[PDB]
Amino acid sequence: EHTLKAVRGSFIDVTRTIDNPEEIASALRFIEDGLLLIKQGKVEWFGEWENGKHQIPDTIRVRDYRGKLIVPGFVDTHIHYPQSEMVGEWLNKHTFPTERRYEDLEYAREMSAFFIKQLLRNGTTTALVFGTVHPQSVDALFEAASHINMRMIAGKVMMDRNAPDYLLDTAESSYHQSKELIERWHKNGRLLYAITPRFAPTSSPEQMAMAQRLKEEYPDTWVHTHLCENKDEIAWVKSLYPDHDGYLDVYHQYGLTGKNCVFAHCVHLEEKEWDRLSETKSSIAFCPTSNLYLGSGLFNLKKAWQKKVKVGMGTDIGAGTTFNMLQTLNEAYKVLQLQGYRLSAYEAFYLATLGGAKSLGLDDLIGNFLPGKEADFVVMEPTATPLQQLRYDNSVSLVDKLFVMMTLGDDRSIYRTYVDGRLVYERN
Template identity: 45%
Template sequence: MTTLSQDGTSRDTLLRAELLSFNRDPGEGDMPSPGSLEHYEDGLLWLRDGRVHAIGDYATLAAELPADCRVEDYRGKLIMPGFIDTHVHYVQLDIIASYGRQLLDWLNEYTFPEECRFAEQAHAQSIAEAFLDEQLRVGTTTAQVFGSSHPGSMDAFFSACRARDLRMIAGKVLMDRHAPDALLDGATGIADSERLIADWHGKGRLGYSVTPRFAPTSTRAQLDAAGGLLRNDATLWMQTHLAENPGELDWVAELYPGSPDYLAVYEESGLVGPRSTFAHGIHLDNAMRTRLAERGANIAFCPSSNLFLGSGLFDRHAARETGMAFTYASDIGAGTDLSGFATLKAAYQVGQLKGQPLTAWQGFYGLTLGNASALSLDEHIGRLAVGKEADFVILDESATPLLARRTARCTTLGERLFALMMLADDRAVAETWAGGTRRHQRG
């Protein structure tokens, strides 16, 4: 599998398998638009120093291989770029599958008590490691992650990511009202964020996302200060919540009576821009969608969470018609599964209820290059292409008896991808690689 340079360090890794990667949005049709994907039935993925050195048909590239190299044979498996999750709470890992409530009750009954535990650094470290183990097990190599309001929760998370050389974006939650006293950070929240940015943003493959939880738990002064962080450094990201639940909308209108709508609360503080992710965006009108599109922000579509909390059905077609970018996310812990397969399955079900069926082409494009582009990360990840970071998953389409039976009946790549979208789970992820290194291997 590997050849050595003169100093004895590993340089080349060669994997033979079926390869699939998207070049751009494949469109909404039953077949992908011409040129929108790269597919090699018998391909070679050639890695060097953590990046893709070459990719193509095995028969074509075989003649260029070093004489002393060994090719690892993954024929019968499918390699795709690593999955990307644009909205997830690592600190809520242990409350996944807690008996359902709607949003505001969920926060008070489950979320806030759980996040209080992250004042203990040892607990934060333990959950950060467990969360990353789970992410890699389901094939997710990059995520945009909420911590708790404790700065130590982010030190623990970033340290664990750095040790595994993962490309991750994350931030400490900001909230200075309407939460338990143990979670409020009014006196120190911005200063703690500034320290975390200095310590972690741009270190290795890490990025910092300024993270006000949502408008009801931040005063205008805190939202304005968060906007100031973004103005001071255009390379930062921003993540929060928007228009998830009707009760939430009513609360925001009561707390911010001078703002014309929920989105305007964030706009007035300078929080809406090309690196801004707003989770959910279910209860928006087209004027708000258009404003988000004009500023280059994206909505994180969290289908399993939206169904679990009864929040509503995201309108993908309205998003596309207004040019508003949207991404796919698990939203653990209200979401019911960290797996990208489960997210796409739930997105398909939401689409069916809205009369907007989701094709497998759209789903897997969204989970890879689409999410990377919306997060301004497509320069680094999201494709199997020369020069990109070598973050990818190796998928086993016979991982379960039922998946194997269904796949055996498929006659096209599109059918196989749809079967994966609907039937696969973590067992279908044979291996997960990040930065050119195998970080998870099933079994």
């Protein structure tokens, strides 16, 4: 509530949200010789060392990270906590049996600690997290995040049909369990609840009606589901909800579109669906790694810009094979090159930080070093491979340095992770 922390090094952030990718250059700030001052888990002051250093009393030691890159904490807008151990239709062989283990509270506790360590080790300070059907396991996840005062959005999976009996809830149990978790965890410190129907195929009309009820009763909770990942899933949803005008219309007619409504994947959207997401101000989680690993297809980021739809990056751990947001951006580059779309390092860095924060409606809280922002940040270095150090040494522009961090970065690039203005992870 009191003492100042002073962090010195080279900082990169985007200073405001934008509407066109061509505007990112104008919003990007690089301070090679920067100073970040932290008070009460927030940015007190940020800018040039020479402009700010006079504020540092002799009673305080400077944390010197000169030679490293310091960026805002990465934002993962779609990840499954109970799928860390998962290795490769898919649902019945892999997802469901893996998730089954998280009924054991002691397993859920151990894996909550492992899950949070994996995010911090990868520089992820905020995530929108799929829990389990089991509410004990969402408690374990929130308890782990709560210990370090992490800003995390999570929820109990709602799933009453078309899956194994060991993983089914009911419409009613899914209402009461979600409400009780909302009551314990929503706006509990920096924690936030998302109403999390797995997706249309595994939720009865009765359960969709409960999800709608929860959103009506708790207007400031998040909504988090899957949307149009694969053509079979879309066909299956149309066959189960034939009176609705396609997949998104199911969620829309049940009042689950709007501000802080996050749809994962959105690979195979109709024109009408793109416009609905735009009009509702609903959010997409672009999950390139799983989209390639399952051969789901190529997310049209160009169209999302055209349609002014909020996009954040998701790892979709489980189906995606990395926690790392730099590797996720690398896969985004690959997905986009196959569409002849050239993802700039500026745009990638935007999507990983303030862009994703905007997609979760948290851009007033995190995502750059503006005064008043929550002090979540990552000390990075290009030391992952000798090849990364070589390419970084041969880089002179900020775009080239960002590019080397994106294309050859992994967990070894993350030196330190700060959550709530406190050191919560060192590499070693």
